[PDB]
Design a protein around this ligand. Sequence first.
Ligand SMILES: [Ca+2]
Ligand SMILES: [Ca+2]
Ligand SMILES: [Ca+2]
Length: 153
Amino acid sequence: QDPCASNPCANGGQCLPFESYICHCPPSFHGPTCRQDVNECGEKPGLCRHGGTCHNEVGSYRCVCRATHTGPNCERPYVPCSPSPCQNGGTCRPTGDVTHECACLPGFTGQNCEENIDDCPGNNCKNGGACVDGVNTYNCRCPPEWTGQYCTE
Ligand SMILES: [Ca+2]
Ligand SMILES: [Ca+2]
Ligand SMILES: [Ca+2]
């Protein structure tokens, strides 16, 4: 005769007997069986600090920060070069309050030096050798019957 044996609650709620039953919900859900989402933005205005916009979700919320701030609740100020966004040992230079510039190392390119420049366009791999791109170079993956740097030996 346990009413909780049927498992009436959902989304992490704990069933407890009382007189029928009750579902003790986690803070992210509410209602008789924890099936309705709590709007965190509505319960605490200014949840996303420094003029951030709160967006409610099923089981959580997300903060949309303005360019000048960062963090889960837009609390940490945005510094263009700390943490540094440039990839592959690239040097970061700030150009403004929110804009930045990456000085790429030879071989890399793009806004944040994330793209490796393809060195295969003018490759000299012969006899069906496949050009494999590297950092400022390339190597030919030769078929089994051919050897050498350009698949000629
Ligand atoms: Ca509701
Ligand atoms: Ca929510
Ligand atoms: Ca390359």
